[PDB]
Amino acid sequence: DELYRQSLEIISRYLREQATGAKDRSGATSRKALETLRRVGDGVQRNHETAFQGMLRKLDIKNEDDVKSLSRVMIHVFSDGVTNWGRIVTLISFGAFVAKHLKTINQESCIEPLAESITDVLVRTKRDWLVKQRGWDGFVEFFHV
């Protein structure tokens, strides 16, 4: 699955850099995908901060067996709705928000697994749409400014 490896690399690096605050095959897209993500994902976290605040709170993340359980509550929400790049970035954006919180409570070791949960669901349930959109090229294309 190349579409998956690439999605995991992107979402993973975004999540890791967002939490750490420090930067870390299908090259000439991934770099633009990550670039677009930083821009719009940051916007989404900013303009939607109080809703993110409240959700993180509703979630109550205290430890490792809180992230695992997460997938339940997460598939529930990304899966209810229409497919568009706007709901995908909010999916990944909140993921970034959770990652920020994890490094706060010493559970940075659960960031990569978190990025996996997110990636598994994004490409497991909308893989065909992604293929249709030409993957991350569609993403970058959609958000040009």
Ligand X SMILES: O=C(O)c1ccc2c(c1)N(CC1CCC1)C[C@H](c1ccc(Cl)cc1Cl)CO2
Binding residues for ligand X (CB under 6 A): 51-52, 55, 70, 73-74, 77-78, 87, 90-91, 94-95, 98, 114, 118
Interhelix angle 111-132/64-79, rounded to 10 degrees, is: 20
d(CA 52, CA 139): 23
> How near is the Cβ of 13 to ligand X at its closest, in Å?
16
- In the chain, what is the straight-line distance between the N-terminal and C-terminal CA atoms, in Å? 30
Q: 114 or 140, CB closer to ligand X?
A: 114
> How near is the Cβ of 1 to ligand X at its closest, in Å?
21
Q: 13 or 26, CB closer to ligand X?
A: 13
Q: 26 or 75, CB closer to ligand X?
A: 75
> How near is the Cβ of 83 to ligand X at its closest, in Å?
11
Cβ-contact 111, 16 below 8 angstroms: yes
Q: Is 61 left (phi over 0), alpha (psi -120 to 50) or beta?
A: beta
> How near is the Cβ of 114 to ligand X at its closest, in Å?
6
